[PDB]
Amino acid sequence: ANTVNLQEAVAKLKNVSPQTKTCLSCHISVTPGIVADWLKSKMAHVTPAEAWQKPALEREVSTPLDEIPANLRNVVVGCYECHGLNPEKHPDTIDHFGFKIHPIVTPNDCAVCHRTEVEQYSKSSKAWAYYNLMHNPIYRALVNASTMFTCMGKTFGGERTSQETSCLACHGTVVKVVGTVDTISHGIPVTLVKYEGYPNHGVGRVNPDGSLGACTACHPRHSFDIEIARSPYTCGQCHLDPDVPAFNVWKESKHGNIWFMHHKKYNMKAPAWKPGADFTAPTCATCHMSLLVNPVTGEVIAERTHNVDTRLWVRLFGLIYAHPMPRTGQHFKLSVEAMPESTAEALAKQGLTIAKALVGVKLPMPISLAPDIKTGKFLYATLPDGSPGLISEEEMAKRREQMVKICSACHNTEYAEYRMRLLDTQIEETNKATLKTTVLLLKAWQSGLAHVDLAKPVTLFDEYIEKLWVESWLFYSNSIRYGTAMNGQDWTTFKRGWYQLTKDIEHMKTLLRLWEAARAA
Amino acid sequence: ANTVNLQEAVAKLKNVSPQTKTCLSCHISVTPGIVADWLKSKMAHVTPAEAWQKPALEREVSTPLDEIPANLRNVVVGCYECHGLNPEKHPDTIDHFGFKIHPIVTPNDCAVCHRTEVEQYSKSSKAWAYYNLMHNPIYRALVNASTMFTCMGKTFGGERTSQETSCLACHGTVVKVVGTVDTISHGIPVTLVKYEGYPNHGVGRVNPDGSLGACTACHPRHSFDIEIARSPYTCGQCHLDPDVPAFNVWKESKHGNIWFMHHKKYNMKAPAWKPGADFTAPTCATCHMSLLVNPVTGEVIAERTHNVDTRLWVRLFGLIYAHPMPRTGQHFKLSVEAMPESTAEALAKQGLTIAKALVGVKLPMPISLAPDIKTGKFLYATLPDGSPGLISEEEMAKRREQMVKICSACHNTEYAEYRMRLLDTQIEETNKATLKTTVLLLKAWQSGLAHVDLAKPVTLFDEYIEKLWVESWLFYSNSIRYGTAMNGQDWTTFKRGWYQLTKDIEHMKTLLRLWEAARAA
Amino acid sequence: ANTVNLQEAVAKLKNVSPQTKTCLSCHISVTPGIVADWLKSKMAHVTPAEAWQKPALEREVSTPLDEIPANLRNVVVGCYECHGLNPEKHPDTIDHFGFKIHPIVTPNDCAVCHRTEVEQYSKSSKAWAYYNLMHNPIYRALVNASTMFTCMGKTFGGERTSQETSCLACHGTVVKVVGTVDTISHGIPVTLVKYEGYPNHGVGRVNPDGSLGACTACHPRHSFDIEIARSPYTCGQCHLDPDVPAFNVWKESKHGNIWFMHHKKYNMKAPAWKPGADFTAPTCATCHMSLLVNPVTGEVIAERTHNVDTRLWVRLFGLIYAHPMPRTGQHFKLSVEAMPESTAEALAKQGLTIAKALVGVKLPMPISLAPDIKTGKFLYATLPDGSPGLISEEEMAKRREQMVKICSACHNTEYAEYRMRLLDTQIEETNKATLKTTVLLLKAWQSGLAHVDLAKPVTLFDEYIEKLWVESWLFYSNSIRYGTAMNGQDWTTFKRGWYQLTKDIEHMKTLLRLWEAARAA
Ligand code: HEC
Ligand code: HEC
Ligand code: HEC
Ligand code: HEC
Ligand code: HEC
Ligand code: HEC
Ligand code: HEC
Ligand code: HEC
Numbered sequence A, B, C: 001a002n003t004v005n006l007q008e009a010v011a012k013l014k015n016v017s018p019q020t021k022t023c024l025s026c027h028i029s030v031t032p033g034i035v036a037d038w039l040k041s042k043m044a045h046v047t048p049a050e051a052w053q054k055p056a057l058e059r060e061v062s063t064p065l066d067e068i069p070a071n072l073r074n075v076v077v078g079c080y081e082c083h084g085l086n087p088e089k090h091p092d093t094i095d096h097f098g099f100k101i102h103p104i105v106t107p108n109d110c111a112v113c114h115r116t117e118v119e120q121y122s123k124s125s126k127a128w129a130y131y132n133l134m135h136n137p138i139y140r141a142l143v144n145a146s147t148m149f150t151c152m153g154k155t156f157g158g159e160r161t162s163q164e165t166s167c168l169a170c171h172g173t174v175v176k177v178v179g180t181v182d183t184i185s186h187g188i189p190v191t192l193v194k195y196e197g198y199p200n201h202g203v204g205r206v207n208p209d210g211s212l213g214a215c216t217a218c219h220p221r222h223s224f225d226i227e228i229a230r231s232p233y234t235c236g237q238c239h240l241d242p243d244v245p246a247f248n249v250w251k252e253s254k255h256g257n258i259w260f261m262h263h264k265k266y267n268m269k270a271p272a273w274k275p276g277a278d279f280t281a282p283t284c285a286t287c288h289m290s291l292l293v294n295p296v297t298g299e300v301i302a303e304r305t306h307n308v309d310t311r312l313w314v315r316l317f318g319l320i321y322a323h324p325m326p327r328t329g330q331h332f333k334l335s336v337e338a339m340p341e342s343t344a345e346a347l348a349k350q351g352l353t354i355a356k357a358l359v360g361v362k363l364p365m366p367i368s369l370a371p372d373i374k375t376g377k378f379l380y381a382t383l384p385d386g387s388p389g390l391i392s393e394e395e396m397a398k399r400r401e402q403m404v405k406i407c408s409a410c411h412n413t414e415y416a417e418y419r420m421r422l423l424d425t426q427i428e429e430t431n432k433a434t435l436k437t438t439v440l441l442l443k444a445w446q447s448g449l450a451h452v453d454l455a456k457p458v459t460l461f462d463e464y465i466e467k468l469w470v471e472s473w474l475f476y477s478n479s480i481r482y483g484t485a486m487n488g489q490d491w492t493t494f495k496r497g498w499y500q501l502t503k504d505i506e507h508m509k510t511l512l513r514l515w516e517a518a519r520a521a
């Protein structure tokens, strides 16, 4: 009763390769969950040659048929079709019952049939997420301050332990092949690959073949189901409260309420997604990634993208302020002047002379630590060629207009623009609140309540009042901006929003007051 | 596959007005999501004259047929039937392809066919939610302290920005029509209304025609689906942790666990809701709003209400204590003596002389700040005519008994009463904990750790220790009472309950101790 | 439309006892929800004699047929079959329309047909949960510190009030029969039992007949549905953030994401659960309790257990450190040496002389407060017979291997072992962080920032810095271990994980610094 007879289901398949038939004949008994899951995939039932017969909008392969290897064109995508691809390019290739297979199927393997998707992904911030985090000295200092501590002379935590179960679970690990292990399994002797850093399915996973990304985030193996990729649950693996509460905001939004109750009557599987005809409430994919087509006119409302950056005009994740979206996905290459001298001079006139040590310093961040007091403007990062690191105003306006075109499937244009204008005001206000907590932190360093040493960036984030400052942007300003962008309510208020942000400001002020009272006493 | 062919669905409709046929012929291509959503509504398929043929219990119209305008009686409720209603009464009425339409359809428009529902709603605290919050000087001070701050001489945040994305998202904004904007849309020149304060769908939204409320909270447009109104998700737009965690409490409750797994076999659509026959686990609507009828006897278990106040005997939301429910929905009209003189004298004998300044002061709150030390009783608010502002004991007992009658569909009476008695003990205990944190706050003001000035109520809520006091009632006492009332577990404990409340008390005590140590040093 | 006609459904039943027919004829009108719910149970449609005809793997009765009372063998399990069982053994037995019935049906009643399940449960930590919590003087002190306070000389909170709505809601209450109440109900005079401590359905509920447990946790009455028992929602009644966030961790895990979207195509009802054939993503029951059978080979992958302890090798809930699983469910019988003298001497050499008072002291905990500084090892508890209280290394390895066998239905063995190794590193690291906060607490007591008196254990947990210490293990270390074990992401990081733990350490250090600054001033 919903029970799948696995043997009968395998026997009814067609266009299975002789190789895959061998894998299945064994794996159906040793890993029945994998076989059942694979049986649910569109890939188990469609050959590349068949997919290429479909009209462009409906088709979900993108490597031209004549560029797909001949032995793959006329069989469904089975165990051998993925795991046996390009053995010589995979360091985790092992002999396995007469076949040369590798366990970690990578974006470069996917690209054999989905070239366009991999090309798009590889340019994205997601693909570069490990380097964006771990090869940025400032961000890595935050990683370190958050996941390491000392106990009686020794340091605990680090990349392969505390960081692997935390930051790198979402951002991605570096996978290293370190050997093999001989096991006995269901009576059979089997050699398995020994890894460091796998299992891991973070978006910027660094694979053994050097490609970047895990293509099983969003649509997990082995079902590879776009119905899952278009659900909110799948993005909720990584987009949660307190730092990146897109799932929580959406769940409380009316879009979310309606989707939970009505999605049973939506068509979640049509490759060209049709607003109205297929769904009446948007999910993450609807606004961020999906191909959207007008059900009556056939007009493309939005082209599919596997580079999510291309839809965003303003980065709501504060670093430390919200800022125009970076032009490329390699954020670790950004460099900005940290502190304008006119602002530093104004700070020093009020007794905060610490800002002086930041004049002329470059930081690997998209935006400066303070605006210029004369102009009222922040400084924006450049790339190593000296070109602007963030998108132009014209590009922001184009992206904003494309998003409004999506809303316009279900709302009038002024309605959508009104919300985007409100979002601008919240970007402005949260950025000012973040500047305020930043100045309070400079006071903490000036008065000796906290210690700082720029040659050792972990010292920016390693004490309690410094963590309060971090939360002001990383948790509260972010939540307010997210909640405004995606129609939240409590995430902009008591849970993680304005109330928390204003509380945090006062919390910092109280600590400073107690410290001064303890000194001047 | 669940895909709706919109053109075919429109063509199969019957009793559509000539006007609406014109709207549809265009809107099917320009806003396909709205048309699909409207197609799912009961209103797209039933005329007022047809609804009036149904038996009283089954019927979901309430304005007598002969009082519904003749041109509306024999057509389904389409785009023109709502948006073209009473043009002269709506300031947002604009010419629109030959029709006089207004975008914001208001409770007064709904009342054309649903008079009883609007009459009920208009008396409720929900309808008055903007005024209850924003026109109460004390509560508005809390709004202000939570959503505004100063940075280098300037104030940031306010009604149209930080407050609009936060408090007013749930409570409601004031909608102002400020002009129009000429746009080009799908090649067509179209003039749209320019608003301040819309989009917004908070319960007390102040509409352009002066009516109060958004009738798309709970059952959103354009499906207007009671299956959504009876889901927990819809109330979860606004009833969330930390301040009003009814959704979170219910989700963890056994009622919630069972509903999540069994509701696929419930009839969520029958207008007269039948316990047992239609559902075996209650949602928010079941206990708070729904018409409930015994499936075997036909006895009405509970009459439907759109004034949720009528079912509540005790306000669990502390202001600052839990108190008997107000008699009317206009809470901003309540006035109470703040501090009994016998209590103030007792406070002053222990060195807390601040309470003296509250003797004879009236506050716009339902209950006094402290009980009378002689009698042990709180003082309750009056209304401007001097009559009691809160319901009588006899009325509380009636409401309590009506709720128990609902539980009795699925439980014995003593079982339900036992829980309501437990709730009374938690009201008593949380109120005492709130009195304790209030006295700690008086100590903070007395010792100079915090500043207060009653002529400027924002100063009640603008510092860290004051926000700790706020949380003791607004978050923790509330959560404990909610969790007890609706069968929570962790919301009464570690998440937001007893543990947090006792921690908060000690947190305040520690701050006071540190402050005194820094002084007497 | 999903509406059940209750009268017709009752009339279609077969093998109903004459007694139950009498109960139904009345209860269908007075408690329609209970009758509808019971109608959905497998027990309403199967007799014990019929269940015994089924093959062993499929069968869900376990008391041998010839040991089930003859009058129960050939009727379905109706109202009288449960509520009329063994009247003389139940103190809440009352006369009720000619029948001798008791409202609280207990594990001993269930055992009449499900002997094996009750035998298993009765040995488990769950069955003993009230005593584990309330009869442990240290844990009871934590209960007290968290749910009681004083206001002007009087104590508020306690077992029948604050604790009943909090800790005891999950752990269980002690049910006392205290009398009866005469009510009028639907016109009928009816006497009901008056209880203290019921309603309650915590796992260790102490029933009126002296048996331990509530068999309606996990699979609630009256549907008693294993589809509910195997859902995540049901365990989420009690396994939530911040202390025991298994539900929250699972929800964010890929297992959870997939289950939410695919479970509509799973067979959630087959008594012998088949990975792959019946489901492709695991729930709580899958890994913790269920009978799992290979769909192709028929091999038992895991035997069903109602003693969840039997599957666990290491207790992730810190007391105060993570430790090997106790051998028996009676945790209140454990006793450990608290402080090794070599460690105390090392502490005293650094000025923390308080540890001296713990040398030779036994605490009712599974593990010592600090490791021995010489050996680097913790001390483990013994039982009253002096035998080891925690499982052997050999037993841990067996349990670990059994769990890996479950994962192996859907993953290779090295993949699963890799995660369990990562879990070991997190146990090690979180335990060291917990030792660090414990030493900070000893500094707080030494410096006079906090007060302690071992003769009065509530003083361990009654002040703010002490509660910060509690959270370091009870919330943060626990969440990190849970998230690692069950594939969380944000629960190991910003929500309740590494970031919070390192923040807590620094929060304690800041308080100590402020205190010292206020003294040396
Ligand atoms: C051929 C040898 C393939 C390679 C290797 C991979 N994919 Fe594939 N994929 C292939 C076909 C022929 C199809 C059917 C296309 C059609 O138009 O019918 C697909 C489909 C997908 C999908 C869509 C699934 C859905 O539910 O609609 C996805 C998400 C997908 N493929 C992803 C994917 C990944 C992640 C791959 C490597 C791990 C991968 N594909 C490899 C052909 C082939
Ligand atoms: C039995 C004769 C097998 C056939 C033929 C194939 N597979 Fe296999 N595989 C088998 C076992 C018993 C195991 C280990 C199970 C366990 O519990 O550990 C595996 C493992 C794999 C893996 C993972 C290997 C690793 O190093 O991690 C993969 C990716 C895999 N199997 C796929 C696969 C393919 C592609 C096959 C044919 C080309 C194939 N298997 C055949 C048993 C047998
Ligand atoms: C429109 C109805 C949305 C749906 C539903 C969801 N997202 Fe969204 N998102 C939307 C907008 C208009 C914006 C602002 C765009 C910009 O340029 O800033 C966002 C923003 C995000 C972000 C922030 C990215 C950043 O700039 O730092 C994230 C991470 C995000 N959205 C993800 C996301 C998720 C996980 C969603 C469902 C749970 C989701 N979005 C839904 C529009 C909409
Ligand atoms: C009441 C039963 C409605 C009928 C039938 C239709 N609409 Fe509607 N519409 C209604 C309300 C109550 C509101 C907003 C006020 C609120 O409290 O929700 C609206 C709004 C619109 C809008 C503007 C908002 C937006 O999302 O852009 C449009 C463009 C709109 N309605 C169009 C529309 C069409 C095409 C309709 C029939 C298919 C239609 N409305 C019917 C209430 C009602
Ligand atoms: C006639 C011109 C209408 C006005 C304007 C509005 N409503 Fe209506 N509504 C109308 C009819 C004839 C019916 C069908 C009643 C029946 O017994 O069949 C309804 C129904 C509803 C419902 C019930 C929907 C359900 O799923 O059961 C709701 C919740 C509802 N109507 C709300 C509503 C609102 C919010 C309106 C203005 C925005 C509104 N109605 C206007 C007739 C008319
Ligand atoms: C084309 C000739 C139209 C017909 C006839 C009607 N509508 Fe319309 N409408 C149309 C467009 C292109 C737009 C704007 C879309 C966008 O993306 O901005 C609208 C807008 C509305 C609105 C909102 C107006 C506002 O000021 O916010 C409403 C409420 C609306 N339309 C409803 C409506 C009704 C009730 C109509 C007939 C009486 C009707 N529309 C006709 C296109 C056209
Ligand atoms: C009974 C099984 C309930 C269901 C399910 C839900 N609610 Fe409830 N609620 C119930 C009772 C018996 C009470 C106490 C009544 C009183 O007089 O206080 C409540 C209380 C609330 C409140 C508090 C209102 C106040 O007094 O301040 C709210 C806001 C509320 N209930 C809303 C609500 C929501 C959003 C629910 C599901 C998520 C919900 N209730 C379910 C009974 C029951
Ligand atoms: C066991 C398989 C049951 C049978 C069959 C029925 N009931 Fe039951 N009932 C059962 C338990 C285990 C409990 C409470 C103890 C617990 O741990 O859950 C109850 C309780 C009741 C009550 C009182 C509680 C309440 O909600 O009011 C009533 C009034 C009740 N049961 C009635 C009842 C009827 C009408 C039954 C058949 C339709 C019935 N019970 C069957 C266990 C079992």
Ligand code: HEC
Pocket (backbone or CB within 6 Å): B408, B411, B412, B413, B414, C019, C022, C023, C026, C027, C030, C079, C080, C083, C084, C094, C096, C097, C099, C101, C102, C103, C183, C185, C186, C188, C190, C191, C192, C193
């Ligand atoms: C009417 C003549 C009845 C028949 C015969 C039986 N039950 Fe009953 N029961 C009836 C009423 C009106 C009530 C109280 C309802 C209320 O709202 O309070 C009950 C109560 C119970 C209970 C709970 C009793 C308690 O002390 O808490 C149980 C467990 C119960 N009923 C079960 C039951 C059984 C097992 C019966 C036949 C053996 C039976 N009921 C008959 C009405 C009537």
Ligand code: HEC
Pocket (backbone or CB within 6 Å): C232, C235, C236, C239, C244, C246, C247, C248, C250, C251, C255, C282, C283, C284, C285, C287, C288, C311, C312, C313, C314, C315, C316, C317, C403, C485, C486
């Ligand atoms: C595997 C895919 C899991 C599923 C899904 C869930 N649980 Fe789990 N759990 C799993 C493992 C491998 C472990 C560690 C085992 C050990 O010996 O420690 C756990 C641990 C728990 C615990 C901690 C018990 C303790 O040691 O203190 C709890 C309370 C728990 N699991 C419950 C639980 C719940 C409520 C789940 C779904 C929400 C759940 N588990 C899913 C494996 C898996």
Ligand code: HEC
Pocket (backbone or CB within 6 Å): A023, A027, A031, A034, A035, A038, A043, A077, A078, A079, A080, A081, A082, A083, A103, A104, A105, A106, A201, A214, A215, A216, A221, A222, A224, C410, C411, C412, C413, C415
């Ligand atoms: C791509 C479309 C796949 C095909 C078809 C199959 N597998 Fe796969 N497999 C794939 C990926 C992308 C990965 C891991 C890397 C990632 O980013 O997710 C795997 C992994 C495995 C493993 C090892 C991991 C584990 O859970 O143990 C095994 C044992 C495995 N795959 C076996 C397997 C079988 C039996 C397949 C057909 C039934 C099969 N794979 C097909 C991608 C793809």
Ligand SMILES: [Ca+2]
Pocket (backbone or CB within 6 Å): A450, A451, A452, A458, A459, A460, A461, A462, A463, A466
């Ligand atoms: Ca520092």
Ligand SMILES: [Ca+2]
Pocket (backbone or CB within 6 Å): B450, B451, B452, B458, B459, B460, B461, B462, B463, B466
């Ligand atoms: Ca103040």
Ligand SMILES: [Ca+2]
Pocket (backbone or CB within 6 Å): C450, C451, C452, C458, C459, C460, C461, C462, C463, C466
């Ligand atoms: Ca103490």
